[PDB]
Design a protein around this ligand. Structure first.
Ligand SMILES: C[C@@H]1CC[C@@]2(OC1)O[C@H]1[C@@H](O)[C@H]3[C@@H]4CC[C@H]5C[C@@H](O[C@@H]6O[C@H](CO)[C@H](O[C@@H]7O[C@H](CO)[C@@H](O)[C@H](O[C@@H]8OC[C@@H](O)[C@H](O)[C@H]8O)[C@H]7O[C@@H]7O[C@H](CO)[C@H](O)[C@H](O[C@@H]8O[C@H](CO)[C@@H](O)[C@H](O)[C@H]8O)[C@H]7O)[C@H](O)[C@H]6O)[C@H](O)C[C@]5(C)[C@H]4CC[C@]3(C)[C@H]1[C@@H]2C
Ligand SMILES: Nc1ncnc2c1ncn2[C@@H]1O[C@H](COP(=O)(O)OP(=O)(O)OP(=O)(O)O)[C@@H](O)[C@H]1O
Ligand SMILES: Nc1ncnc2c1ncn2[C@@H]1O[C@H](COP(=O)(O)OP(=O)(O)OP(=O)(O)O)[C@@H](O)[C@H]1O
Ligand SMILES: CC(C)(C)c1cc(C(C)(C)C)c(NC(=O)c2c[nH]c3ccccc3c2=O)cc1O
Ligand SMILES: [Mg+2]
Ligand SMILES: [Mg+2]
Length: 1179
């Protein structure tokens, strides 16, 4: 890493921004090298800005009765804020005094021998000094203010991430990810750039006050009659401002709901593709955009009138000001041109600078109120007593989940429970699905607080969750989990948990970079890593929430006898399990039932008891847009044509006539200057040109999102395992919101300003030729410097834009794995790990931000340099009477003012046009591409399975044949390939060979038509946010009576009746309200509804007990009558049902007819079988 060149730099270098110069020269010739990206300055790091504001916020919490976050921000930013404000004031004041100096220099070309001709040179000197001071006075203050705004945002972002880790288990149900992601995605670039515009609240009034006097000098009565029109217009904009904000709050609720649906479906797309929910998910996301875009359009139409106010005002402010003075006294052109020059600044001050400044203050404080509201919430309390006899004691405990019934005190999940545990013995927590076994562990950890009862143990605890969580990184980084490495400990664990088999198969042996969640691995592999993490941790208590769910019996025995009873000796360790073998070796047993202790004692006792392309493609999405743009241009040509013949008549005039005083001399060089002043209004886009342009540009973003969401869903699996969670969630949140909100109007201003320049030059050029020639040398200078700047700016903007993903990627996983982070207590790791992601983004954003102010300053300096040259050539060459050089040049330089604004607008479009470029990359992804399934017989021949293209072959030369209406068992060691074989049928991963069904092959039919033959039950369960009926059939093909007629057989009768809205209860946080057992029965019903003749079952009974399993076989015997079944199961009770068996090992298959033969070969796998299951197989 290279250190910041800002650190060591002279006042000149910092003032003129010469320290940014290297990266432009480096970026112009070549592609940007990672080496060239400088380290962030020491001032604005994540640690310091956290440390500073954290201290000031707890001080605010400690002192005041009702604390406010703005008070905390005030005491560490206000002086440096106000320090730049006084410079930004003086830099703005100097724009208001330019008309006085320039106006005289213009008047000094007049043949009539005025005093001006005396002072002209002194004004010539002074006006040059007037420009030089402003250029140096404005830009540093803006960068200074941007730099403060960046520090403010980083400081809060860090306090949100510290706060969110200490947040209560009660609150997590209410606040989804969409709440957090939107809050950060909104403020990310908007807040930083804002603090430039913030000050103009108090700059604009003093500017109006200053300007009004200078006008009052010229026009005594009418100036106030003018101002009145702007006071009327200012209130109209304040009206639109309040109206626009109300549309934004109605929409904000809908965006949060779309992101949680969009996240969930892409997070586990492998299930979405298996069930064939493309039409379902697209229609669901489509319906949420209807409400959103309605409120976007209404917000967009209002903002047009706010934006357009400046351009229309121009003519009317001057007209109402000159007209009264004209009638009573009579006016000179000089007097008209001087008022025009004051009015341009006065409008800019009151019409664009004033309403933008206020709108920023609403957004900032609005944002700070949400953060302050988020910071003062219910926190997870800690009450650990390290003093103990290492005796984990529980007595007379009851607990309710929701606040209502618990506070009022529905049945509690635990009641009248008690147990004592000595150190050096394991507890067997047994019961049926929904007994409260997880709920019991949640009370011990203290995530679920008890209403009545008392807990006490030592603070040190270890936890193994039922849903296995893999943070992004290496298997080592997962197993050690943010502590020092130990060769003797690490190796003894992996051998005890026996991952040595699975780790050795991978190319990079130990350390492979696992994605968000670890979908690279299988169900059994994740569980053993989750276990290894819990084992490697040292603590007084080890909680294990059924880690033998996805493991085969041979592995389940070996790991239980090699880890739990060997490596974990002389420790209290409460275990969730439902097998006789585990309860036999166990010391004390606890059998829960309907949240009540059915039995408590010992096992002995229990038995005794009972670039051009990107711009072009965007325009040619929607055909309306190209018609509207042509329709604007033909009307533009008409108004350019209209002004031409007006000025042709006006200039050709042959002129008691007190209305307007003109003479041959004055006429020539004021009539044209007046036109350039009022050109902004004459060429302005009226509601007819404005509204449809805005309307279509929103309709484009609607079409672009549909294609993008459509293309992502039907892309191949390999491409979707490449990209991250935060990478998907970045675009759909931030880069779709840019095409809806910012881009539609940033274009309008760019077009509006571009037309005004062209049309003004055109009319002036056609009428007087030399001005066109005079502009060219200034025109080329801006286009030259623009083409030079963008070569660096474009490349920086992509690094910064793709530099966001790390912040989101981390925020997703952190939240999902929150319960283990607090179990182990690893917040200090994750905070410092999160600080990096902000620093990375700061390093790219700060660099892009600083490079801009260079271009902003240089473009102004180019103008100043040319103006200084123009003015001296004007004044010095001035003849004795009618000097016809300075006239022509200054008129050009009066246009280049409008162009300088258009070039700055042209950069603001290009930066937002990076968003649409990154959207098209997601649209341009590759694509995976009599009654038919009669009997359902399959024929596999020379099949090969691999995930990556040209990688390791998981299965090789596979070939077997199933007969019609036959049940087939599938089995093998954890990580054999059992899932890969089931995925090979649906052909999700890329394969070679052919699987032919009922004498018809793959290549004879389409994929989406092929996949509607199979009814799947995947290994990982997918429950999106919605109602039960929606989760049971998204297409809504079946009736309520039909769903109820299925619900009884799978036995969700009692499960649903618990909740208030029967089949209308909206599930949240990926269906966290249901227990692990009910999620398996949810997938079962979903398959029972979808009446298929072939169906695949990737381990139906994962964590189901022998009682609940009776439902699986009951529904498998009755409902699935004549259809062919491929049953991939670990429990041995399931093997009684199916006839043929497939065994996978050594990347190959073995088919068998009888169970007795299969078990006869493998002695170890036969000895593994439970005594209670052994009597069933062998009579
Ligand atoms: C952020 C704040 C800053 C401060 C402030 O608020 C916002 O903004 C200030 C703004 O800048 C204002 C000033 C702007 C300039 C104004 C100028 C004005 O006089 C002007 O016009 C002439 C006065 O009419 C003056 O010269 C005349 O003065 C006569 C009397 O001495 C002499 O005769 C001869 O000189 C000239 O005589 C002739 O002057 C003609 C000028 O039009 C008259 O028409 C004519 O009758 C008269 O015979 C001339 O020198 C000057 O230009 C003066 O009277 C008021 C004035 C100073 C204003 C007072 C109020 C302010 C300060 C505003 C206010 C505090
Ligand atoms: N966050 C929650 N909010 C509301 N109810 C919940 C929540 N978590 C669990 N429950 C409910 O509490 C009961 C017990 O759930 P718990 O997960 O403790 O059961 P379990 O015995 O661990 O089940 P399994 O055998 O499936 O693992 C169930 O009825 C479940 O729906
Ligand atoms: N998405 C993937 N990308 C790369 N390799 C993968 C992927 N999924 C699985 N594998 C590899 O294939 C092996 C077999 O995984 P698979 O899920 O088919 O096994 P399984 O027998 O179904 O496991 P389980 O006992 O957990 O059900 C894994 O151990 C891993 O090495
Ligand atoms: C009839 C005709 C000539 C097509 C026409 C009419 C108007 C109205 C009626 C809106 C003044 C306008 N005016 C506008 O479109 C205006 C657009 N934005 C504004 C913002 C603030 C204040 C006024 C306007 C405005 O008049 C323009 C026209 O070209
Ligand atoms: Mg459970
Ligand atoms: Mg599997």
């Amino acid at each position: 890493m290279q250190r910041s060149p800002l650190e060591k730099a002279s006042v000149v270098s910092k003032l003129f921004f010469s320290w940014t110069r290297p990266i432009l020269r480096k970026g112009y010739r070549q592609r940007l090298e990672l080496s060239d990206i400088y380290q962030i300055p020491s001032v604005d790091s994540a640690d310091n800005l956290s440390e500073k504001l954290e201290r000031e916020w707890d001080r605010e919490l400690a002192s005041k009765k009702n604390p406010k976050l703005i008070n905390a921000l005030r005491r560490c930013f206000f002086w440096r804020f106000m320090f730049y404000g006084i410079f930004l004031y003086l830099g703005e004041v100097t724009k208001a005094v330019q008309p006085l100096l320039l106006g005289r220099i213009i008047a000094s070309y007049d043949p009539d021998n005025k005093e001006e001709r005396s002072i002209a040179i002194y004004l010539g000197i002074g006006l040059c000094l007037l420009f030089i001071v402003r250029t140096l006075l404005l830009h540093p203050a803006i960068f200074g203010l941007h730099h403060i705004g960046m520090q403010m945002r980083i400081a809060m972002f860090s306090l949100i991430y510290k706060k969110t880790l200490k947040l209560s288990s009660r609150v997590l149900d209410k606040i989804s990810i969409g709440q957090l992601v939107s809050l950060l995605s909104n403020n990310l670039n908007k807040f930083d750039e804002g603090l430039a515009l913030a000050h103009f609240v108090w700059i604009a009034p003093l500017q109006v006050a200053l300007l009004m006097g200078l006008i009052w000098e010229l026009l005594q009565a009418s100036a106030f009659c003018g101002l009145g029109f702007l006071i009327v217009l200012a209130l109209f904009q304040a009206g639109l401002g309040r109206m626009m904000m109300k549309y934004r709050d109605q929409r904000a609720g809908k965006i949060s709901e779309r992101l949680v649906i969009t996240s969930e479906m892409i997070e586990n797309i492998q299930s979405v593709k298996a069930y064939c929910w493309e039409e379902a998910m697209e229609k669901m996301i489509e319906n949420l955009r209807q409400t959103e875009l309605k409120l976007t359009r209404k917000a967009a139409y209002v903002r047009y009138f706010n934006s357009s106010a400046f351009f229309f005002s121009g003519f009317f402010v001057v007209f109402l000001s000159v007209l009264p003075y004209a009638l009573i006294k009579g006016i000179i052109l000089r007097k008209i041109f001087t008022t025009i020059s004051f009015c341009i600044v006065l409008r800019m001050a009151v019409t664009r600078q004033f309403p933008w400044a206020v709108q920023t203050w609403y957004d900032s404080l609005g944002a700070i109120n949400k953060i302050q509201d988020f910071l003062q919430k219910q926190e997870y309390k800690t009450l650990e007593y390290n003093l103990t006899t290492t005796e984990v004691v529980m007595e007379n405990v009851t607990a309710f989940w929701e606040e209502g019934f618990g506070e009022l005190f529905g049945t509690p999940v635990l009641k009248d429970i008690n147990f004592k545990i000595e150190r050096g013995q394991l507890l067997a927590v047994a019961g049926s699905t929904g007994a409260g076994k997880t709920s019991l562990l949640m009370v011990i950890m203290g995530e679920l607080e008890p209403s009545e009862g008392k807990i006490k143990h030592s603070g040190r605890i270890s936890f193994c969750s039922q849903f296995s969580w893999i943070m992004p990184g290496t298997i080592k980084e997962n197993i050690i989990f943010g502590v020092s490495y130990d060769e003797y400990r690490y190796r003894s664990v992996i051998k005890a948990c026996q991952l040595e088999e699975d780790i050795s198969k991978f190319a990079e042996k130990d350390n492979i970079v696992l994605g968000e969640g670890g979908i690279t691995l299988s169900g059994g592999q994740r569980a053993r890593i989750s276990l290894a993490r819990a084992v490697y941790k040292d603590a007084d208590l080890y909680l294990l929430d059924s880690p033998f769910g996805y493991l085969d019996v041979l592995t389940e025995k070996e790991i239980f006898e090699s880890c739990v009873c060997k490596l974990m000796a002389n420790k209290t360790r409460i275990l969730v399990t439902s097998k006789m073998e585990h309860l036999k070796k166990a010391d004390k047993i606890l059998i829960l039932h309907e949240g009540s202790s059915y039995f408590y004692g010992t096992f002995s006792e229990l038995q005794n008891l009972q670039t051009w392309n990107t711009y072009l493609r965007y325009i040619t999405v929607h055909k309306s847009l190209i018609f509207v743009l042509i329709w604007c241009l033909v009307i533009f040509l008409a108004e350019v044509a209209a002004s031409l013949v007006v000025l042709w008549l006006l200039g050709n005039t042959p002129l008691n006539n007190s209305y307007a005083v003109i003479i041959t001399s004055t006429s020539s060089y004021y009539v044209f200057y007046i036109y350039v002043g009022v050109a902004d209004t004459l060429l302005a886009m009226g509601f007819f040109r404005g509204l449809p342009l805005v309307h279509t540009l929103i309709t484009v973003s609607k079409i672009l999102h549909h294609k993008m969401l459509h293309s992502v869903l039907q892309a191949p699996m390999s491409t979707l395992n490449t990209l991250k969670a935060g990478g998907i969630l970045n675009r759909f949140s931030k880069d779709i919101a840019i095409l809806d909100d910012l881009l539609p109007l940033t274009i309008f201003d760019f077009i509006q300003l571009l037309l005004i320049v062209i049309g003004a030059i055109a009319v002036v050029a056609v009428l007087q030729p030399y001005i066109f020639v005079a502009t060219v040398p200034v025109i080329v200078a801006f286009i030259m410097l623009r083409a030079y700047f963008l070569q660096t700016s474009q490349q920086l903007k992509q690094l910064e834009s793709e530099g966001r993903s790390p912040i989101f990627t981390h925020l997703v996983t952190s939240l999902k794995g929150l319960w283990t982070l607090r179990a182990f207590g690893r917040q200090p790791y994750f905070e410092t790990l999160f600080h990096k992601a902000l620093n990375l983004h700061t390093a790219n954003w700060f660099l892009y931000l600083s490079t801009l102010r260079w271009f902003q300053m240089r473009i102004e300096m180019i103008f100043v340099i040319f103006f200084i040259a123009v003015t001296f050539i004007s004044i010095l060459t001035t003849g004795e009477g009618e000097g016809r050089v300075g006239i022509i040049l200054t008129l050009a330089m009066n246009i280049m003012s409008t162009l300088q604004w258009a070039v700055n607008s042209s950069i603001d479009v290009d930066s937002l046009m990076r968003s649409v470029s990154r959207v098209f990359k997601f649209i341009d992804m590759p694509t995976e591409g009599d009654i038919w399934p009669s009997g359902g017989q399959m024929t596999v021949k020379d099949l090969t399975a691999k995930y990556t293209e040209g990688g390791n072959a998981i299965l090789e030369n596979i070939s077997f044949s199933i007969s019609p209406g036959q049940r087939v068992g599938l089995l093998g060691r954890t990580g054999s390939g059992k899932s890969t074989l089931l995925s090979a049928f649906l052909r999700l991963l890329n394969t070679e060979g052919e699987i032919q069904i009922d004498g018809v092959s793959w290549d004879s039919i389409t994929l989406q038509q092929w996949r509607k033959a199979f009814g799947v039950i995947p290994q990982k369960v997918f429950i999106f946010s919605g109602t039960f009926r929606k989760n049971l059939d998204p297409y809504e093909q079946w009736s309520d009576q039909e769903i109820w007629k299925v619900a009884d057989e799978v036995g969700l009768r009692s499960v649903i009746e618990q909740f208030p809205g029967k089949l209308d209860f909206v599930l949240v946080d990926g269906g966290c309200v249901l227990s692990h057992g009910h999620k398996q029965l949810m997938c079962l019903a979903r398959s029972v509804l979808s009446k298929a003749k072939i169906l695949l079952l990737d381990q139906p009974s994962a964590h189901l007990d022998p009682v609940t399993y009776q439902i699986i076989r009951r529904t498998l015997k009755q409902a699935f009558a004549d259809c062919t079944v491929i049953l991939c199961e670990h429990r041995i009770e399931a093997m009684l049902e199916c006839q043929q068996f497939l065994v996978i090992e050594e990347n190959k298959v073995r088919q068998y007819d009888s169970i007795q033969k299969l078990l006869n070969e493998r002695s170890l796998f036969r000895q593994a079988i439970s005594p209670s299951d052994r009597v069933k197989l062998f009579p």
